[PDB]
Amino acid sequence: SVALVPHVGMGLETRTETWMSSEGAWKHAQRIETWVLRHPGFTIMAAILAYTIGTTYFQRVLIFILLTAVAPSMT
Amino acid sequence: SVALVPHVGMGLETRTETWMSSEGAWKHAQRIETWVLRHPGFTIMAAILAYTIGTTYFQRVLIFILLTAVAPSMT
Amino acid sequence: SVLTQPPSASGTPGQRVTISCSGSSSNVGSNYVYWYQQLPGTAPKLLIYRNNRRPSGVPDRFSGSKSGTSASLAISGLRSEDEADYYCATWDDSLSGLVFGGGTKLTVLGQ
Amino acid sequence: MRCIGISNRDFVEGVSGGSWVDIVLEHGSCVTTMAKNKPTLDFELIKTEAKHPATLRKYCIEAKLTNTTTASRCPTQGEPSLNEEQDKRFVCKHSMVDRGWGNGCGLFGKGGIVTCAMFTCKKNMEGKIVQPENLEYTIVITPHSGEENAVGNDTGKHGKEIKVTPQSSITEAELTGYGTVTMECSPRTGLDFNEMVLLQMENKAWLVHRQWFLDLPLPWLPGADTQGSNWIQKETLVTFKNPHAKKQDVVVLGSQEGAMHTALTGATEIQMSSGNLLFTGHLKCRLRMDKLQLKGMSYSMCTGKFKVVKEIAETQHGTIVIRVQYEGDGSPCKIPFEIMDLEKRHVLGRLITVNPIVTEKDSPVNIEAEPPFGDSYIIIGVEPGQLKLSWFKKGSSIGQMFETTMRGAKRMAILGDTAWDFGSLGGVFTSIGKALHQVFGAIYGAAFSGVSWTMKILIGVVITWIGMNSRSTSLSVSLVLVGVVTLYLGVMVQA
Amino acid sequence: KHPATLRKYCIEAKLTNTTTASRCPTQGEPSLNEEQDKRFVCKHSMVDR
Amino acid sequence: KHPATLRKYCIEAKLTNTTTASRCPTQGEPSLNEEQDKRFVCKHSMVDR
Amino acid sequence: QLVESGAEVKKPGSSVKVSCKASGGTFNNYAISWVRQAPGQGLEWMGGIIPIFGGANYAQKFQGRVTITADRSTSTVYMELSGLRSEDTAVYYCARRPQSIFDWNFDLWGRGTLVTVSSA
Ligand SMILES: *[C@@H]1O[C@H](CO)[C@@H](O)[C@H](O)[C@H]1NC(C)=O
Ligand SMILES: *[C@@H]1O[C@H](CO)[C@@H](O)[C@H](O)[C@H]1NC(C)=O
Ligand SMILES: *[C@@H]1O[C@H](CO)[C@@H](O)[C@H](O)[C@H]1NC(C)=O
């Protein structure tokens, strides 16, 4: 819907509070956290897959974070 | 928004078609495609970062894909 | 300390009358002094604001005076219209509030 | 004295050889400018009117459906046709239902079916556009004199309001008693209204990106339409349902106002009820002080007694403001104001209400000064009745430097390369920096457009890690610097 | 049959009786009588004074 | 001189007008009208039903 | 324009709320104060409020007894008296002044609401 394209990285931000700025600052983080709480099984699988795919701990953690962030997002 | 938490992956699906199955089947992919078209700059930077971080073509491609899919999603 | 005014003031038409507003340095002399002309059964009308300043649309017969600690309101020419209670208002720093003069009625003669 | 009481006040000191200075005026901010021999002035951008807006698209946020009709073909006879499939005020869909002898075909299979309903709009968003030459900026110039009618007030009794347009971008303000100030502004490079839309939904309005407005997934009209009846993406506000394969229905998708509100996060809300008023954005102006003179420099020191009618109150900017009355004899006179140490051996602070003067005896005048960190004494008057006022400033010079640097970084974060024109007086270092910032900002905006703040933080961390685990020192340092700047921008942005 | 209500969400609201109160700097929080009632959605912020 | 109260703390209270509400298991939270008013201190718990 | 509520008859120990509606410009750019005058007596300032900001200021005499509030949605200013008594019988005015701590010129006044504790 329109809600899924929320005019954020548009580069028109001045020194004035944007519309729903305070809420939208952490709404996505709250959504990811609630999803990880409600769906522990996918997080464990994502950790296992990130460990398997990545050789260095940095890219393992990066893969885990990207998978966890996009798992609820694709929904 | 409530629109950010759709009722997908809940395990209640039957043979009956869902509320907006035809619509919502490809809307996420269309959104990511439109975003990648509108922001070729971030896609190129993501490609460079994925090539750098990943030692193997699989890690690099996975990192690039996840970065591209998550950039609009958090957006 | 608080605003004090003569309870009554007399006069004759075509005269000059000045009403005195006496207070302490806390209220008068450290803040502006406002003069209000109230007719019977009517909301007070702002007469002088700040010090010796007349709101737009007021006749020049009215003139305010500000001393180091006391204030006065002078009338150029007197008439039957001038017979009304006159109040001086000034912010008080110690009292942390606005203090009114207490009232002064101009008793024009010629009855 | 208007900038006193605004947290986003800025102090601009000094002019160039030409007696001009570059200042960027933002709506929520106030600029106070000071030169060696000029009166202190406060500058506020209090309006930005867009005039004569033209609509370019009306989106439908709530529709209804009527006149639903269905057609079908028995299996193997091709797709059906409805007269309404060519009608633009109708939304149609093609599907397959199950047919047979019970349904009334005579052949068993999937027979095509099409259903159409008339699409009607009940509420819409009108995304008006305005020509960049129709913008009008109102700027108030108030002299920082000390006369009581201007101490942080937001009125125009003493302030002078100058209207600036792209066509008449050079204007002068006649400041009674201080000469005139010439403002040479560049509204065209201000906000680039050719790539922006004025989005008015119901009684609320936003300023939005035109590509974002044209990419919205709602149905729209071109804006030249006076009757609707030709909405474009009608399929976005409807859903066709064929549960199983026995019926095909179509329903509307409910008011999209709240979804639009969610989509509008990160867009600065504007006003569009009584004209298109934009209380957001900045204006770069070159300020010409050459015909600007102090009022009363040909006055004699007062030589009388002052009384402090309002105690000294400190502001958010490290300066102090004091309201003093005069009770001496020479009415228009220079006020003997100094900020010294206890022994009155050294001068420690500078006053901001430059050249304070008593215009009238029982007319309080309130001076603003900038006292030093720690102990200092404000001396007002001459010896016969001189008053000495102790003050203590809580901060530190190192802390002040840190806060100045942070304000500079934040200005660069908000104005980008326009932050190199704030307080600018020419110079080659400023020009070199602005060019470098322009190129780097072009690259950075290309690489980070459309990205949220969490994504920026993640990219900054990734780039910083890449740089830190870098074998080459030059590339290591460059990547670390880029990543740290990215992290700072992500932490500062509202995206 | 015989369903029981589990929760009623709000999808469309209206706001009325808007009021504000402020406290001068350093003097703590301000107070509205309306903060006692749960029918009012309140917010605390800082304003330049 | 001229102090300004910054905060008023309660050192001793009394509870009156106590009321309780419950809902059957699986049927969501109970509701009390008093929970509308912020003069009432409220807590939610579970009981065996 | 500054329109006040109608006259009210109350009883000792009761409360009276006086309203004072105002225009949009005067509501958001000015301040509203309440001044009472007992019959045959001078004006007495009770308090005021900057409706855009709220947080009314009260005279020491009326501290704890009065509550001045502003309804931003209706652009109306309210005054409520608790513990009404005979000595509280007087006409109450709502007056408009600039929202600055130094200037107290009430250039615009309401007609005034008279509160009485006897029969009319
Ligand atoms: C829609 O249906 C109405 C009756 O409900 C009819 O009067 C009207 O002509 C129809 N319009 C169409 C089919 O375009
Ligand atoms: C809300 O305001 C209306 C006036 O519009 C008033 O009648 C009502 O009592 C008020 N309610 C509350 C809870 O403040
Ligand atoms: C509390 O209980 C008393 C005694 O029954 C009653 O008079 C009063 O109205 C009650 N208060 C509330 C808020 O229910």
Element (H, E) at A70: helix A57-74
The residue count of chain F comes to: 49
Q: Which residues in D81-111 are b (16+ Cβ under 10 Å) and which e? A: ebebeebeebbbbebbbebeeeeebeeeeeb
Contacts D215 to A, Cβ<8 Å: 5
Lookup: tokens for D461: 């961390």
CB pairs under 8 A between E and G: 34
Whether residue A73 and residue B69 make contact (CB cut-off 8 A), yes or no, is yes
Q: How far is CA D19 from the centre of its chain?
A: 28
| D369 three-class SS | strand
Whole domain around residue B17: which residue ranges? 1-72
Lookup: tokens for D493: 């942005």
Q: Which residues in F7-43 are b (16+ Cβ under 10 Å) and which e? A: eeeeeeeeeeeeeeeeeeeeeeeeeeebbeeeeeeee
In eight-state DSSP terms, residue D371 is P
- Closest atom, ligand 2, to C-alpha of E39: 13
Which amino acid does the sequence have at G118?
A: S
Answer for the pair D467, D483: CB distance below 8 angstroms, yes or no.
yes
CA distance G77 to G57: 14
Give the contacts of D258 (CB within 8 A, at least 6 positions apart).
Answer: B1, E11, E12
Largest alpha-carbon pair distance within chain A? 46
Intra-chain end-to-end CA distance of chain B, in Å: 13
Contacts G101 to C, Cβ<8 Å: 91
Point out the residue among B20, B41, B72 whose CB comes nearest to the CB of D446.
B41
Q: Is G63 on the interface with D (CB under 8 A)?
A: no
Main-chain dihedrals φ then ψ at residue D419, nearest 5 degrees: -70, -15
Q: Which residues in D407-433 are b (16+ Cβ under 10 Å) and which e? A: eeeebbbbbbbbbbbbbbeeeeeeeeb
Lookup: tokens for D264: 């509008």
Main-chain dihedrals φ then ψ at residue D123, nearest 5 degrees: -150, 145
Which amino acid does the sequence have at D401?
A: M
Say if residue B7 is exposed, middle or buried (CB neighbours under 10 Å; 0-12, 13-18, 19+): exposed
Lookup: tokens for C63: 């003139």
Nearest CA-CA partner of A8 in D442, A20, D281: A20
Pocket of ligand 2 (CB under 6 A): E 17; G 74
Main-chain dihedrals φ then ψ at residue C16, nearest 5 degrees: -120, 120
- Which ligand gives the minimal distance to the CA of D118? 1
Contacts G102 to D, Cβ<8 Å: 148, 151, 310, 323, 364
Nearest CA-CA partner of E45 in C88, A21, D247, D11: A21
Which amino acid does the sequence have at B31?
A: R
Measured by CA distance, the residue closest to atom 1 of ligand 1 is D67
Nearest CA-CA partner of G42 in C109, C87, A48: C87
Beta bridge partners of D379: D338, D388
Element (H, E) at B43: helix B40-53
Element (H, E) at D209: strand D204-209
Beta bridge partners of D248: none
Preceding residues of all breaks in chain G (C to N beyond 2.5 angstroms)? Answer: none
CA distance B50 to B54: 6
Chain D 262-291, residues with CB within 8 Å of chain A CB atoms: 262-269, 279-282
Contacts D258 to B, Cβ<8 Å: 1
Element (H, E) at A29: helix A21-38
Answer for the pair C91, C27: CB distance below 8 angstroms, yes or no.
yes
CA distance D278 to D261: 19
| D236 three-class SS | helix
Q: Is B5 on the interface with A (CB under 8 A)?
A: yes
- Which ligand gives the minimal distance to the CA of F34? 3
Q: What is the CA radius of gyration of chain B?
A: 16
Closest-CA residue in chain G for C44? G109
Q: How many domains does chain B have?
A: 1
Nearest CA-CA partner of D22 in D409, D317, D417: D417
Question: In this structure, how many other beta carbons lie within 10 angstroms of the beta carbon of residue C55?
Answer: 13
Lookup: tokens for G17: 């709320």
Point out the residue among B20, B22, B71 whose CB comes nearest to the CB of D451.
B71
Answer for the pair C24, C2: CB distance below 8 angstroms, yes or no.
yes
Largest alpha-carbon pair distance within chain D? 119
CA distance G15 to G5: 15
Dihedral angle over CA of F4, F7, F13, F15, nearest 10: 120
Say if residue G35 is exposed, middle or buried (CB neighbours under 10 Å; 0-12, 13-18, 19+): buried
Element (H, E) at D306: strand D306-314
Q: How far is CA A29 from the centre of its chain?
A: 6
CA distance D350 to D354: 9
Answer for the pair D28, E48: CB distance below 8 angstroms, yes or no.
no
The residue count of chain E comes to: 49
DSSP per residue, G77-97: EEEEE-S--GGG-EEEEEEEE
Element (H, E) at G76: strand G76-81
| Method of elucidation | cryo-EM
Give the contacts of D264 (CB within 8 A, at least 6 positions apart).
Answer: A6, A7, A19, A20, D199, D201, D206, D208
Ligand 1 pocket test, pick from D67, D70, D86, D227 with the greatest ligand atom count within 8 Å of Cβ, gives D67
Resolution in A: 2.8
| D487 three-class SS | helix
**Beta strands G8-9 and G113-116: pairing type?**
parallel
Answer for the pair D203, D125: CB distance below 8 angstroms, yes or no.
no
Nearest CA-CA partner of D24 in D412, D202, D283: D283
Give the contacts of G70 (CB within 8 A, at least 6 positions apart).
Answer: E19, E20, G27, G32, G49, G51, G54, G76, G77, G78
CB pairs under 8 A between D and E: 8
In eight-state DSSP terms, residue G13 is T
Q: Where are the beta strands (DSSP E) in G10-75?
A: 16-22, 30-37, 44-49, 57-58, 66-71
Nearest CA-CA partner of D24 in D393, D419, D404: D419
| E41 three-class SS | coil
| F49 three-class SS | coil
- Kindly report the nearest CA distance between residue A31 and chain D, in angstroms: 13
Whether residue G71 and residue E18 make contact (CB cut-off 8 A), yes or no, is yes
Give the contacts of B21 (CB within 8 A, at least 6 positions apart).
Answer: none
CA distance E49 to D432: 40
CA-based angle G29:G33:G35, to the nearest 5? 155
Lookup: tokens for F43: 């807590």
Sign of CA dihedral A34, A36, A39, A40: negative
Q: Is E23 on the interface with G (CB under 8 A)?
A: yes
Answer for the pair G94, G75: CB distance below 8 angstroms, yes or no.
no
Answer for the pair D487, D461: CB distance below 8 angstroms, yes or no.
yes
List Cα–Cα distances, D311 to B14, C92, G74, in angstroms.
77, 14, 38
Whether residue D450 and residue B53 make contact (CB cut-off 8 A), yes or no, is no
DSSP per residue, D122-180: EEEEEEEE--GGGEEEEEEEEE---BGGGSS--SSSSSEEEEE-SSS-EEEEE-TTSBE
Please write down the long-range contacts of D343-351, taking CB distance under 8 Å and 24 or more positions apart.
D344/D377, D344/D379, D348/D372, D348/D376, D349/D376
Nearest CA-CA partner of D39 in D349, D355, D366, D287: D355
Whether residue B41 and residue D445 make contact (CB cut-off 8 A), yes or no, is yes
Measured by CA distance, the residue closest to atom 14 of ligand 2 is E17
All partners of chain G with 3 or more CB pairs under 8 angstroms? C, D, E
Give the contacts of D47 (CB within 8 A, at least 6 positions apart).
Answer: D136, D137, D138, D277, D279
Q: Where are the beta strands (DSSP E) in D341-450?
A: 350-351, 357-358, 365-370, 374-380, 387-393
Lookup: tokens for G86: 């005979």
CA distance D345 to D339: 10
Where on the phi/psi map is residue G64: left (φ > 0), alpha (ψ -120 to 50), or beta? left
Say if residue D311 is exposed, middle or buried (CB neighbours under 10 Å; 0-12, 13-18, 19+): exposed
Ligand 2 pocket test, pick from G19, G69, G71 with the greatest ligand atom count within 8 Å of Cβ, gives G71
CA-based angle G20:G74:D125, to the nearest 5? 155
| C21 three-class SS | strand
Question: In this structure, how many other beta carbons lie within 10 angstroms of the beta carbon of residue D246?
Answer: 9
Whether residue G102 and residue D148 make contact (CB cut-off 8 A), yes or no, is yes
**Beta strands D196-201 and D306-314: pairing type?**
unpaired
Main-chain dihedrals φ then ψ at residue G105, nearest 5 degrees: -90, 115
**Beta strands G2-4 and D30-34: pairing type?**
unpaired
Q: Is G24 on the interface with E (CB under 8 A)?
A: no
Measured by CA distance, the residue closest to atom 3 of ligand 2 is E17
CA distance F23 to A10: 49
Largest alpha-carbon pair distance within chain B? 46
Whether residue F27 and residue E6 make contact (CB cut-off 8 A), yes or no, is yes
Instruction: Look at the block and give the residue holding tokens 């580069």.
Output: A11
Which amino acid does the sequence have at B42?
A: F
Where on the phi/psi map is residue D392: left (φ > 0), alpha (ψ -120 to 50), or beta? beta
Give the contacts of F24 (CB within 8 A, at least 6 positions apart).
Answer: F49
**Beta strands D135-143 and D41-50: pairing type?**
antiparallel
Answer for the pair D355, D38: CB distance below 8 angstroms, yes or no.
no
Answer for the pair A50, A64: CB distance below 8 angstroms, yes or no.
yes
- Tell me which of G57, G93, G105, G114 to substitute to probe the interface with C (most C C-beta atoms closer than 10 Å): G105
Lookup: tokens for G20: 């004072």
Sign of CA dihedral D143, D146, D149, D153: positive
Please write down the long-range contacts of D388-393, taking CB distance under 8 Å and 24 or more positions apart.
D389/D308, D389/D312, D389/D322, D391/D312, D391/D320, D393/D314, D393/D318, D393/D320
Give the contacts of A17 (CB within 8 A, at least 6 positions apart).
Answer: D268, D494
Instruction: Look at the block and give the residue holding tokens 């030093």.
Output: D372
DSSP per residue, C64-93: EEE-SSEEEEEEES--STT-SEEEEEEEET
Answer for the pair D321, D327: CB distance below 8 angstroms, yes or no.
no
Question: In this structure, how many other beta carbons lie within 10 angstroms of the beta carbon of residue D42?
Answer: 22
Q: What is the CA radius of gyration of chain E?
A: 17
Lookup: tokens for D396: 């530190």
Lookup: tokens for D429: 């270092």
Element (H, E) at D63: strand D54-72
Dihedral angle over CA of D357, D359, D362, D365, nearest 10: -40
Answer for the pair C78, C15: CB distance below 8 angstroms, yes or no.
yes
Q: How many CA atoms, within 13 angstroms, populate the side-chain half-sphere of residue D60?
A: 26
DSSP per residue, D242-289: -STTS--EEEE----HHHHHHHTTTSEEEB-SSSEE----EEEEEEE-
**Beta strands D54-72 and D109-129: pairing type?**
antiparallel
Say if residue C3 is exposed, middle or buried (CB neighbours under 10 Å; 0-12, 13-18, 19+): buried
CA distance D203 to D126: 11
Ligand 2 pocket test, pick from E15, E16, E17 with the greatest ligand atom count within 8 Å of Cβ, gives E17
Contacts F37 to E, Cβ<8 Å: 36-38
Q: A57-74 vs A40-53: helix axis angle to the nearest 10?
A: 140
**Beta strands D306-314 and D320-326: pairing type?**
antiparallel
